[PDB]
Amino acid sequence: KEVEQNSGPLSVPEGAIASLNCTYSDRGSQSFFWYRQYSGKSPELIMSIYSNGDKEDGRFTAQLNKASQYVSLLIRDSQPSDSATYLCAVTTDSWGKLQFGAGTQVVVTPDIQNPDPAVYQLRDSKSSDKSVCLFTDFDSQTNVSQSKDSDVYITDKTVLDMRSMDFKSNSAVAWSNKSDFACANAFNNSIIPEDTFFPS
Amino acid sequence: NAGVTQTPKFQVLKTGQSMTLQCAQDMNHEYMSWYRQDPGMGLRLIHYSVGAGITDQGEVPNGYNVSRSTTEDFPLRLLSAAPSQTSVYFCASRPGLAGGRPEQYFGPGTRLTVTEDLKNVFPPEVAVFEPSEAEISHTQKATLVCLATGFYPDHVELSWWVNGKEVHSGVSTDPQPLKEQPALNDSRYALSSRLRVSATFWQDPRNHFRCQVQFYGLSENDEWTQDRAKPVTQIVSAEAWGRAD
Amino acid sequence: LLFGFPVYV
Amino acid sequence: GSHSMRYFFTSVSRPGRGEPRFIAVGYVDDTQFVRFDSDAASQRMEPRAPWIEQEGPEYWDGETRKVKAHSQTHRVDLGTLRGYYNQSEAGSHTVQRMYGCDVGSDWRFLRGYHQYAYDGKDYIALKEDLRSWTAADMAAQTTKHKWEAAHVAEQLRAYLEGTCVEWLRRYLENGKETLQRTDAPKTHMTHHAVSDHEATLRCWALSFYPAEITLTWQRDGEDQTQDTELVETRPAGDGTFQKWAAVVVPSGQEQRYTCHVQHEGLPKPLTLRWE
Amino acid sequence: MIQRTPKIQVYSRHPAENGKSNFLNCYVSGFHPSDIEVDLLKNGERIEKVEHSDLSFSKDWSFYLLYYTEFTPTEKDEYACRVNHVTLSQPKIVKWDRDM
């Protein structure tokens, strides 16, 4: 490993600071880079730094310490669109291999003012053979878990943004078929809040 | 200046087929590279080239070759596809001695899936699940969910269209598809998505909601001797209409 | 240590 | 004492005899520490000082790739410059590049530079502020506008104010016993008969390091460069330097002629008349 | 294009004393172009085991090269440096002057 990058995932709420670190091993490195890669997309260059010290560009601040061989990236006032994998890249010269670190995934979580966690049973526009449960309006502290059951499927927590009310909401989806799949028992593996609303 | 272009975005190869990935660059850069990216491996260099007419191997050359006939173009050939070649390949380019700021720029990628038998390739089935009436009463909001299920390979693009026009304005789609059968390597995939609107927008029966899933699969030229319909590159959709209560 | 980025005239 | 790190690159084309001759040499002060010659065995950057051999294999690999990348720019430059000046392919032409940086006695950055010549005269140089270029002629105005568009100065400034001073510092402490020495000049005084009317007083200075030395002749306080034959400072070959200065004196009046030697190894500037 | 004639200094490393091994130097400086033929002579015949420095150049862009050989000076042996360069119409011989 020429380049060593932290952790993943890095969970930070909106407005907060995401600080990313990386270490490199070649002492004669002269050029230092930060890439942003959204899921299913291509790495996109966001910051380049060439001398010791700080470099600011909007919300991004890149620092370089060549004596400790350390590159860093600060993202201030985190936006939900900052959610990606961030790769540092290091080179020695124009014919030297660009050396990439593994990446640290940064997750920007919504401020949700007052949660109303609830699991809902959605009805099909029936031509399909499943039922869908929707766990929604919960806190960004709440993590949904995967299935220890075989025939059921739970998605990861995602965030939608209703640009009208200025309303953000977290949600996750469970679905199955083979017997009496209930929404009161679908999210059993996850630590869901006490006051989660289950309608009858 | 397009920068680094690359085609195709998606491709299903069958074991032992040849294909070439194209890559083009606009910038007169001398130094072009090919990578693959893989879940536990990071970015891995396959071949690279520091000038027109000359190339050399990277860390992972085996099963690929490469030529650089012009400074603009850097095609990668897989001469005989193997299921370890399933990956996301990225062309990239830096100036070398020609130019500017020494920044490397990447192509948009190519998501190649190699399979042993194209009898494994399936289009999705797409259903839309209408908002729970309990949510409407509790929150004055309405969540539609779209499930795209049953597809292989995981080469899909999901969009939501209200009243004939594409919305981004209240959607959340899973970042990556779920393996439906994680004990298998030819596992079929599922993807979910959400559209949330206000209660009174949902309760308007004029409103048409549509979840569209573009699937990339076989070509129309391909041989297909199953009893199933040929799993071509196609769009599968589902719909729901507004409903007053 | 030599300069890493020489450019053509 | 002040210190510098300098690299010197000479590239010379060879019409009908193939690829250009490329020679690169690196110095710390007046001590050469590295070389590459396109005509030598290894095709690697080679050590030329004991204290640089303690660098690891990645250093030499890296330097070898970077010097070979300089070799390329220079080579293409010889063709490019031939084009700019519309010169025939039958002639040999020379490009030279020199870059590096100075530090003070605090070892902080003092000055950085990057000069470039074609045919033994100034083509283009980075100005003192490390942001701008001085083009010599109309053909070098092309290279300049090309180098402004390619942000060349920015990368150079980053090297000269950063990496150059950082690696100079490392070299100075790695080669402390050789680099941070100062050798005092051993001085002689010789006198030879031209005939019976003229006599040559020659003032010597031997075994000094660093090379920077001033030898001046003077009669009664007033300096005399009207007769001062002064040879170029020459290497002794063991890492020390030599130099002499002569004046032609009316013999018998050798009393009021004084040789003045100044060097950084001298606590006080030496004064000398013929014994 | 710039031509400059070399300046040639022939001299020893240490002060010369007969019977003691030393180094004989030929320093050619101030020249352009870089193409130059330097030989060291013992009694007018070529010395083979002569080393030389790597070509480098001064502030004014002119090159310098040091050619050197290990030797033991005597009263009888005459040493010299032979330099050839485009600026010279015939190759130049500068003898070793022991008090220089």
mmCIF file of C-alpha atoms in Angstrom, chain D residues 8-10 12 23 25 27 32 35 96-97 115-117 119-120 122 192 204 231-238 242 244, chain E residues 1-2 4 7 9 11-14 25 27 29-30 32-35 54-57 60-64 66 99-100:
data_model
loop_
_atom_site.group_PDB
_atom_site.id
_atom_site.type_symbol
_atom_site.label_atom_id
_atom_site.label_comp_id
_atom_site.label_asym_id
_atom_site.label_seq_id
_atom_site.Cartn_x
_atom_site.Cartn_y
_atom_site.Cartn_z
ATOM 1 C CA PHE D 8 22.485 21.261 -15.128
ATOM 2 C CA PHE D 9 21.225 19.721 -18.345
ATOM 3 C CA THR D 10 22.936 19.804 -21.697
ATOM 4 C CA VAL D 12 23.259 18.276 -28.137
ATOM 5 C CA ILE D 23 23.965 14.902 -19.930
ATOM 6 C CA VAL D 25 24.469 16.739 -13.482
ATOM 7 C CA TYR D 27 25.254 19.829 -7.451
ATOM 8 C CA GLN D 32 28.456 17.179 -7.639
ATOM 9 C CA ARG D 35 24.870 12.301 -12.960
ATOM 10 C CA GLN D 96 21.065 23.775 -21.935
ATOM 11 C CA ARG D 97 18.781 24.002 -18.913
ATOM 12 C CA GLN D 115 17.107 29.163 -17.075
ATOM 13 C CA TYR D 116 17.122 27.804 -20.593
ATOM 14 C CA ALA D 117 19.490 28.411 -23.501
ATOM 15 C CA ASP D 119 22.943 27.553 -28.829
ATOM 16 C CA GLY D 120 24.752 28.844 -25.821
ATOM 17 C CA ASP D 122 19.530 32.865 -23.442
ATOM 18 C CA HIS D 192 59.906 35.123 -11.313
ATOM 19 C CA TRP D 204 48.398 31.708 -4.918
ATOM 20 C CA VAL D 231 42.899 32.842 -13.807
ATOM 21 C CA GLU D 232 39.547 31.058 -13.491
ATOM 22 C CA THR D 233 38.995 29.039 -10.301
ATOM 23 C CA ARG D 234 40.014 25.471 -11.027
ATOM 24 C CA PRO D 235 39.175 22.212 -9.236
ATOM 25 C CA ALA D 236 42.096 20.404 -7.603
ATOM 26 C CA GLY D 237 40.299 17.081 -8.077
ATOM 27 C CA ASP D 238 39.900 16.109 -4.412
ATOM 28 C CA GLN D 242 42.732 26.478 -6.629
ATOM 29 C CA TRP D 244 46.008 32.558 -8.764
ATOM 30 C CA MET E 1 25.116 30.064 -32.539
ATOM 31 C CA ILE E 2 28.104 30.771 -30.276
ATOM 32 C CA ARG E 4 34.052 30.040 -27.623
ATOM 33 C CA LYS E 7 40.810 28.207 -21.667
ATOM 34 C CA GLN E 9 45.074 25.070 -17.367
ATOM 35 C CA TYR E 11 48.575 21.836 -13.234
ATOM 36 C CA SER E 12 48.940 19.246 -10.505
ATOM 37 C CA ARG E 13 46.514 18.456 -7.650
ATOM 38 C CA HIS E 14 49.099 18.762 -4.877
ATOM 39 C CA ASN E 25 45.026 17.925 -14.235
ATOM 40 C CA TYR E 27 41.078 21.907 -16.917
ATOM 41 C CA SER E 29 36.810 25.816 -19.481
ATOM 42 C CA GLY E 30 34.864 28.584 -21.126
ATOM 43 C CA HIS E 32 31.219 26.235 -26.726
ATOM 44 C CA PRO E 33 30.136 23.929 -28.357
ATOM 45 C CA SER E 34 30.527 20.948 -26.047
ATOM 46 C CA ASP E 35 32.468 18.839 -28.599
ATOM 47 C CA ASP E 54 30.804 15.131 -16.239
ATOM 48 C CA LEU E 55 30.114 18.044 -18.538
ATOM 49 C CA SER E 56 28.547 20.983 -16.782
ATOM 50 C CA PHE E 57 28.520 24.701 -17.510
ATOM 51 C CA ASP E 60 27.569 32.424 -19.177
ATOM 52 C CA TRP E 61 26.483 29.024 -20.615
ATOM 53 C CA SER E 62 30.075 27.869 -21.392
ATOM 54 C CA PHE E 63 31.241 24.345 -20.556
ATOM 55 C CA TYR E 64 34.009 23.065 -18.372
ATOM 56 C CA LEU E 66 38.428 18.424 -15.933
ATOM 57 C CA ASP E 99 55.682 26.633 -10.973
ATOM 58 C CA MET E 100 52.122 27.192 -12.330
#
